[model samples]
Structure formats: structure tokens, C-alpha cells
Target: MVHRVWVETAHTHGGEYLKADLGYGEFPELEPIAKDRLHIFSKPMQLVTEKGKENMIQRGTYNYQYRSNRPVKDGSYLVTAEYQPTFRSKNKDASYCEQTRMFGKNIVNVGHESADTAIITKPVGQNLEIVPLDNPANIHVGERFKVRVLFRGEPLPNATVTATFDGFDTSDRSKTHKTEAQAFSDTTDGKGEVDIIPLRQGFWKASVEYKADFPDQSLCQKQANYTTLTFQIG
Candidate 1:
């Protein structure tokens, strides 16, 4: 029997979706020489329309159309996607927001499984007009930075923040710190804020994912049930 996988990425600000690349294979060892090397394996993802050309995706909401070239045999193949933080800038007064989120889990085969659906809810965040980099005072590593987590243009307090950084593990379900130099969380003190700082001197990427459900289809801006903010720390 064959089983299909449906992957979706969404944000709350405008209900934008990020793309998830699905492929079959064991996780590959990306860096073999690092001291704290990570072990992961998965299959290769191919776009149906582009034939063998790989699909390059930007940060935002997206849907991956699943199609299988070979019959789903008795054995199960691993389906996975590797994510990296992306940068977004603000225009006028709105700060650009973007993030990559994943929900559900690795589907296990049960006898003859049918179609399965997976959704990753990514939250939308404020838009940043200018992306600050190069200045040491503008960016700090290992210090908390705070941003307004808004739901439909309103401040959301005490909401859970689950995010994964470019070179870090997804262990904590709260806001993430980009690099190793960052030892403490840079979230805001009450009133919707957290201090965040990166450990290294390069551009450290960060994102925030929270749960929100917006129903008004006619609302001025289409905010997703979840929201995310994508920014860089220099």
C-alpha cells in the first residue's frame, strides 16, 4: 500500500506559509569534522514540475505538493526537512516577520496506510524597517532581545515560543538564541518582551512561533492563527 504526506507551513500575521522540503532517505552527516557533530539522515527532495532541479524556497508560508515516483513498499522511508533562519526587513513602520515551523511527527507505517496530512504553524511578527548589522552596540551575543508578539495587531502575553535556530538543536519550546556565545535567553521582561543575544560575532538568526487562531476572513490584514518573526543579529 502507498501513503501520501501533506506538509504545510503557516504564519499568523498574514497567514503566510513556509515551504517544507520532503524527501526519502536516511539523514546525512552534514559536518563530519566538527567536535559537537550532529547526526541526521533523510531522503532527497525533488520537485515534480522542475524534474530534477532542486526547489529553493524563501522564508514565508507555503505548501509542498507530495508526489511519489515509486510505489510505497512495505518498508517506511524517512521524510524530513532541514531548516535555516531567514532575514526579513520592515518598511515604513511594519517590521517584516518570517519563520520555519514543523508540527506532527515521522509517520509510521501501519499495514496499508492511506494519505496523511501534516501542518506546521508559523507565527507572524512585527516588521523591521532597517536590518542592523556590523555595529557591536546594535547587536550583542548572548544577551536577550525583545520583540512585540502581536496577534491580529494586539500584544499577546505569556504565549509559548517554540523555535529552532540555524546551528542549534530544537530542545526548548521557547524563543531561541542563535549562537553558542549566547548563554542566556534575551526575551523581554513582562509587557511582551524578551532579551536575546548571540554568542558569536556573525549574523545570528532567530525566530518565534506561537499559537493563534484568526477567523475573520474580511479583516484588513489576513493574520494566521500562528505568527513568526525572522531577523538577524550581527
Candidate 2:
């Protein structure tokens, strides 16, 4: 089946947040996902640079607000939004769960010590692995990065992983778009891992898709899972 699922940035009405859209018939445009079916989350990540190194200052939970209207701070922030929902088709074999992550960065109060001291990292729910070491505070270009897939607090192997660089585009939209220069795909290894080498300086989103059989058909006979992770690299 052709799946067109994505999380796009929505900034308007004096607030900012990400929207989850799903569609059939492979195309660029997508329809909104049902609010009842999804579990959404958001969090403020403290991007800390010290000793000439960068990494999340701390890890912590996401908020449920449809839009994030919190005040911005100085330094860098990893703003992430996640969407998770179950889709059940008449065909029991086609049921699955969709999970997506949308990331944004807010740079406020630059060069202000008060701003840097006020920021903190709050981790929420499950997380995708951005490896070669988990700290992303010091990622550099021309280096190999890896991703690990997880489900139910365990590693998920043999899944398909895709890495796309959502660089700044003049493509008539504020959100990142996929182009020939920003696409890559691979399958997870025995350890549920894939490697990526980012060539540019921008936000990179990596996603994984996996399938499993569930004995509890009440939820789903067959289950498909999609996980996405977004981060900044330079």
C-alpha cells in the first residue's frame, strides 16, 4: 500500500505546532488525521553547548497542547512533536499503527546568559536512537550517524529506515520538503540499526517502518509501526 503520512509545521494565530496529515493515492497533499485516534506530544529540549561541545543538557515529558505557545529562550531548542494512531481497515491483515515525529528549532535570546540558564530539556514517551553516541550536542557533517528502531521498549529489527534532510527550501512552504538531494533509505540490521551520513547543515528526519503479528486481534491482527526521529546536524 502507498502511504503518504507526514507531520508539517503549522505556525499561525500567534502560536506554533505541528500537524499530522495522512493520505492515500501517493501525492504531495494529505488530509488531516483524526484527533481522537492520535496521541500527540511536545517538549522543550535544551540544546546546550559547553566545553565546545553540544548535547541535550537534560532529558525529560511532552505537553498535550495542540499548539506550543510557550515563550522562547536563547541558545538552541529541539522542539519535537509526535503523532501516534491506530488504523484498522476492514481487512484484518491490514491494521497497523502510525507514529511520526516532527522537529523544529527555536533560537531566542541569543547572546543572553539569562536565556541560556533558563532553558532545559524535557524528554517524553518513546524515543528513536540517533547514534554513534546518543548525545546530539556535537554532531558534525561528513560523519556517520546511526538510528535504532524500538518497540515496546525493545529493539525492532529488519525494519525499513529512511533518512531525509529537510533543509531550507524555497518551495513555497515553511515546512521542510523532500527532494532528490535529501532522500535515503535502508533496512535495519540484526540490531535494529541503520547508518546515515549527513552531508549538509540542517535538520534531518529519520523514520522507520516495521510489521508484526499480534495475538490480540481486538486491537489489530497484524500491526505495522512507523517511528520517526528528527535532529539538527552541522
Candidate 3:
């Protein structure tokens, strides 16, 4: 029926190592967030004409809406759009999806499917980047500064980010840093925002970190990488 397929990017709970085999039939393997497996181009293209057999055939790109069973907050994933004729068996690896060669073009390598990389940041309830609390004012040992973290889905409640303060002396060698956290440690107020007052500040480093969970059972495992920002106060 339809004639093409392409790949997209997203987070995989299980991991980025594509467990699904293109050589296999329909896309039967799906991660949790990907509730119902998606198939691009209900069918594939057919070859005709002798010249058609003498060139590097080009297939169109396929766009897909990706969903995860659970929240995806980390790791890289590969989304492939494949094409094959509809009359062929849905499970047969043949009938379509073949390889072609072309000179001066990128060399075709055979191996597992995977992405180069991915930054898994969500605003809607998932972990993310926080707005910097730039140098706040009001010089009082008790007055506090607020740090905000951001993600795409929503403000992730009960999430934690670390704030570290580097201590220095006139010699610049006493370098002893103290660290603390203001995670969901404050309050959500139902919306995804919270306020926290810094206890003591000189040079503070704040960072957000989290992890992703996958269900495909074949993908590689990964932990959320850390993102940090620095600020200062009197």
C-alpha cells in the first residue's frame, strides 16, 4: 500500500539497542511507553523495469507518534520506517526491504540498529533543566534563594537535584565544598513548581538527574546523565 519509512528519535525505557529485527516480520517488539506497536506504510513498494533493478532504490520516510508504557526520561532510541509490498507475508523478511549499493554515497554497513545519542529531557512531570536563580539579593544570613528545574511534560514532583557550595579562602587553596539538595523536598502546590530558600551561599552548583525505565527487555540500560548550573551570592 503505502511506499516508505524513515527513522525518528526518542527515549527508550529498556535502552537504545534496537531489539527489533528488520529482517523479522511486522514490528512485534515494542517498549512499554509504546503501548501498541506501530507499523509504517501498511504495505511496501515493488520493483519493475530492468533499469529499476540497476540503481540504488530510494524509499520514502515514515513519521510515527511514539508513546512509552512508562515515562521516558533517559537514554537513546532508534525508530525505523520500513517498506514492503502488502501481498507478501507480514512475517516474511523477504518480498521487500532489500539492500542496494551506490558509489560516492555513504557505505552501507550491516549490524544492530541504534542511535548515536539522545538527551532525554521532559518538562511534563519528567526531570529536566531548571531555570537559574541568578545572583539573588537581600543580604541576610537567613534570606534564601530559589532554584527551579524544568522538564517538558510537567514539573516532576518528588524529584531531587543537588546543590553544592565551594568554599574558598584568600589563598584559593582551602577548596572545601559542601553539598545539599532541594528536591521535591519543598512542595508542588499541585502545579509543577516549588520554592526553596538557600541556607548559606557563596558559590553554589545545582544539578538535576534521573533515570529511564524500558520494557522491551532487549534494549541497553542507561542512567540519566547529570545537568548542572552554577550561581553566586553574598
Candidate 4:
């Protein structure tokens, strides 16, 4: 199934805050995401102007419908939304305050923007084991790329990272062909980095999951955190 996460302008031209939507395939609407599962972040993202000028502008500005008056400047802005995975255990004592977060990005043009220069920069410095790119900008088929998994800017040793294709059979003639779901996994090294290569390219994703137990019984028995990174390769 095709998964689409997009941002919609409240007004056709512009608005204070863009409404973010997530759906699958042709369905444009789905149930409202739980507040615990949804996280929106805003910051100044780097971009190139229409005249090939490097600039920075406030991006990913998230505000509730009640009090959203953030300024929308002229430049390319990146809006990143993350939906964390739900973790429920049979052990009633095992409770978690957070879930594994899956991220999606969308670019919005305020004044002048270039389709050729538009790039969605990852939010680094989040102080979490949020997966971020640590490889070359251009990735070719049959080439290995490295990614770092860090927690609070520290390397997380011996973490599990899984890579898989997002969807299947995107070719023009293979409309009905179903590509079998396959996945591969790798363990992060002492530096919290792993190398992966694409077998067949379209859209691919890599994810890392980590779990921990608290010694204090009062504080939840166990907790887990995870992050996924998505990219496209031609």
C-alpha cells in the first residue's frame, strides 16, 4: 500500500499553520492520530532560494487551532511529523511513556522556491536516538551507505537496525504484480553506525529499536524507544 503523509494549507494561498495529514494509498482521510503518537517540531531549516542563494527560514512550525500565529517567511520550509509506534505488554507493570517514532517530512514554499534545489533536511540535535543520515548525498544502486544511531548525541552500541522496502511493483506495466515483503537487519557497531546497500530501489526505510528495564519497580518495569528513517533511491 502507498503511504502518504502530507501537509495541507488551511487557506488555498496561505495560513498560519498547515494541517498535517497521514493516509494510505488512495484514501485521503483516516482516523485522528492519538496525541501520544503524534509529535510536531518546528525550527529554521536550511534551503536554497530560487536564485540559487542559500538561506534559512523557520520550518516545521506546529501550532494548535486555538493559538497559532507563527510567521511564515519567504523560503523553503520543512515540516516534520512523527508518529510513534504503540507498545503494549501482557505484563501490566510494563508500561511506557513513549513509543517508537516514525518520521515524515513535507516541504512548503512561502515566496520563491526551486523544485530542483528543494531538500528535506533531517532534524539532528534532537538529543534522542533518532536515526539520521551520515552518508553521501547521492546514493546509487548496489552501493553501501552508513547511518548512525545516537542517543542524546552519544553512540548506542549493539543496537538493532532493520532495512526494508516501503512498497512494491511501482513499474508502469506491473500494476497488479505484488512484490513479496522481504527485510534485512544489521547490528550497529561500537560507534553506533551500520552500513546498508540497496538491492532493488524505489523507496526504502531503515529503523532502529532499543529497549531497557528500570530497576525501580515504581517507575514502570520496562521501556523502549525506536526511530525509522525513510529515503528514495533511483
Total clashing pairs for each candidate: 55, 6, 24, 0
**Per-residue lDDT of model 1, residues 24-50, tens digit only:** 111111112123211212222322211
Worst 10 residues of 2 by lDDT: 56-65
lDDT, model 4, position 222: 55
Candidates ranked by lDDT: 4, 2, 3, 1
Residue-wise C-alpha lDDT for candidate 2, range 1-234, written one tens digit per residue? 233333333222212222212221122333343454344322223232232213222111222223333422235333333334445554435435433333222222222232232232222234433222243334477776665565555666777777676543336342443332336677778886777767777656666655556547565555555545555565
Itemize residue pairs with steric clashes in candidate 2: 54-137, 55-137, 60-122, 60-123, 61-123, 74-108
Better of 2 and 3 by TM-score: 2
Worst 10 residues of 1 by lDDT: 24-33
| Candidate 4 error regions (>4 Å) | 1-79, 83-89, 92-130, 134-137, 168-182, 214-217
lDDT of every model, 2 decimals: 0.29, 0.42, 0.30, 0.45
User: What TM-score do all the candidates reach, one by one?
Assistant: 0.31, 0.51, 0.33, 0.51
lDDT of 3: 0.30
For each of the candidates, the C-alpha root-mean-square deviation to the true structure, in angstroms, is: 18.7, 9.3, 21.9, 8.9
Ranking by TM-score: 4, 2, 3, 1
- The prediction achieving the highest TM-score against the true structure is 4
The positional error of residue 67 in candidate 1, measured at the CA in angstroms, is: 30
Residue 230, model 4: lDDT of 49
Weakest ten-residue segment in model 4 by summed lDDT: 40-49
| Better-scoring candidate (TM-score), 1 or 3 | 3
Better of 3 and 4 by lDDT: 4
